[model samples]
Target: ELRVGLEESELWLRFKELTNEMIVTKNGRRMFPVLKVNVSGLDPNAMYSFLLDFVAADNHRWKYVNGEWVPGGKPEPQAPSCVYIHPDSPNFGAHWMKAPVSFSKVKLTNKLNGGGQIMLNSLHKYEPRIHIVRVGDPQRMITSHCFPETQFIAVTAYQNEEITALKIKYN
Candidate 1:
């Protein structure tokens, strides 16, 4: 079976407890605690690819109070978005696990690439998932996993003062 895990899960947990906030702008915002992962159980000789995408964890809108997040209410639908594939995709499985997988280049932007770049709403909850597939085969979705502790809320600005403090304290 394919296995995927985070390289730095503790950091993600800390941020998740306070609702990890990522600043999204017109251009893009690189994730902090990024998405460094470890992939194993691959066909060593076969090629593989990694693509990044954000999946909504809930359907409700969230509001932050004191230091917690709760369902504020529901509003409108979300914008179209797509996976942000690794530039060095379709590389040998040996290459994918050569070192910790890094998605620092995966950008989050409000402006869509007409349905690309992983767009998100300012108050919506999302989880980052890495999809691993056989090389040169986009149809084959080998496996993918999303970290619940890494769930975050996208915001153009800080939503919680307490969470903001941690952001500055740690980052």
Candidate 2:
């Protein structure tokens, strides 16, 4: 049976609650949220990779102004596609899950320097995705089923009134 794993389940619940309320903005907001994952049922000796992908909400570009979402003045040629690599990747999936297993926290930014900042149109909505990979013996690699199916909810605005909480109940 297909199921939302523990980590993803918690995240989806939190995102739903957060998006349901009004979002205010004075300065950019930081998500109290972070993603934490636990894994089992893997061979201990295999190598693994972790990756994250961000997708545009629509083909059109956008800008934020007057506390509203609007189209950007002009659609410049599409921005370069970029994905951040988890710094501690190429790990043995089984080994990393030993105890309190954690992946490095991911961040969103628009700084000039490419310091984990994803360049995005001012008001454009985006989605983020995370992936896990497993490399087997003889250099064969199998990406975990978790990768493509992972879901990401966007936090496009700041200062949301509701304090949404994320919790996990595993079976």
Measured by TM-score, the strongest candidate is 1
Model 1: per-residue lDDT, tens digit, 1-171? 677778888988888776688878887878886788887778879987788888887778788776677887894486565788898887988888778889888778777754346788878878888888785665765687887877888888888886778878877
Candidate 1 error regions (>4 Å): 113-116, 136-141
lDDT of candidate 1 at residue 23, scale 0 to 100: 79
The estimated TM-scores of all candidates read 0.89, 0.57
Q: Among these predicted structures, which one has the highest lDDT?
A: 1
**After superposition, which runs of candidate 2 have C-alpha atoms over 4 Å from their true positions?**
1-8, 20-31, 60-79, 99-104, 134-159, 163-171
lDDT of 2 by residue, 38-136 (tens): 666655676777666566546565544564445655554444575666777788755656743443455454433556644444444455555666655
Shift in Å, residue 111, candidate 2: 3.4
